[PDB]
Amino acid sequence: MVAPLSVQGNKILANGQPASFSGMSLFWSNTEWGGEKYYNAQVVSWLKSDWNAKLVRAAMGVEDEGGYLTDPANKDRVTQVVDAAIANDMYVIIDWHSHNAHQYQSQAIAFFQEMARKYGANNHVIYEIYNEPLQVSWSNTIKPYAQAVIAAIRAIDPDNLIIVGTPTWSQDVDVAANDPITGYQNIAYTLHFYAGTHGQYLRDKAQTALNRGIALFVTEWGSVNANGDGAVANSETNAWVSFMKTNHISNANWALNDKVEGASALVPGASANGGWVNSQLTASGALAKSIISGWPSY
């Protein structure tokens, strides 16, 4: 049984102590976007057995073409991954993979209510309600949306973590920390980085947020450039890894996918059902597996 997770100040706790978990993000769930083939039980069990992953993220597209708003089959793919995470005793992040979620509050509420009713009794579930807000106000745009969605989840699932996206593609955790979400337990805040583009400047905003007493979760990170492509930046990735290990920050690498781009963990044609030998991982994938499998035990 995975531990129920909670927040106290800047820490996510398991069994009364800071704990952190490392794994992979799936790519966009969207129909015809390629990554959908990896949303299955075999992939989830392989990530556990071969990568020693403790976490998987289901990245459910929303207003993007082929996403949940126009194609509900996206949610069936999410369900497959959630069921498989629970069966494999892995945490699972249910991600509303939107850039504009404040426009779709009632849809988000209805979706997270269903997810909470069905899955809320499990320790495994982590709700991520707003992937990557753009250059929009924390106080006036994101936080009202978050308050409403959190109220709806908490009425059903009083405990399990809810992770809230932050301004500028989930960079401005320092801004969120000056106006945190109150009145509900076990709320944390999203930080996203790509080590080819982001370094100490972004680490400093993260440190500021931590010092101001909010907890961070890296629901998405890449070893490559911020556009999802380019060379693996080994040195800067190791810097980010140390930062996350020091501060007990959970992390999901982008992405378990076979598209030709730097962020893909897999070569094109890597099997939809797992079993990948090392020579079928990309430089990004091999580094991701190394970080995940070497993540602290707790």
Author numbering: 1 to 298
The authors write:
It produces a diverse collection of GHs, assembling enzyme systems that can degrade cellulose, xylans, mannans, and xyloglucans, among others. The work presented here comprises the design and validation of trisaccharidic xyloglucan (“XyG”)-type cyclophellitol probes and their validation as bona fide, predictive tools for the identification of xyloglucanase activities and their discrimination from cellulase activities within a xyloglucan-elicited C. japonicus degradome.
We found that Cel5B and Cel5C were both cellulases, efficiently degrading carboxymethylcellulose and mixed-linkage β-glucan. Notably, the active site cleft of CjCel5B is significantly more open beyond the −2 subsite, so we hypothesized that cellulase-specificity in Cel5B is dictated primarily by an inability to accommodate α-(1,6)-xylose residues in the positive subsites. We also observed that growth on glucose resulted in low-level expression of Cel5B, while growth on xyloglucan resulted in expression of Cel5D correlating with a decrease in observed Cel5B activity, suggesting that Cel5B is acting as a “sensing” enzyme that is repressed by the detection of xyloglucan. Extending this analysis to xyloglucan-grown cell lysate yielded a complex pattern of apparent glycoproteins, including a band at the position of Cel5D.
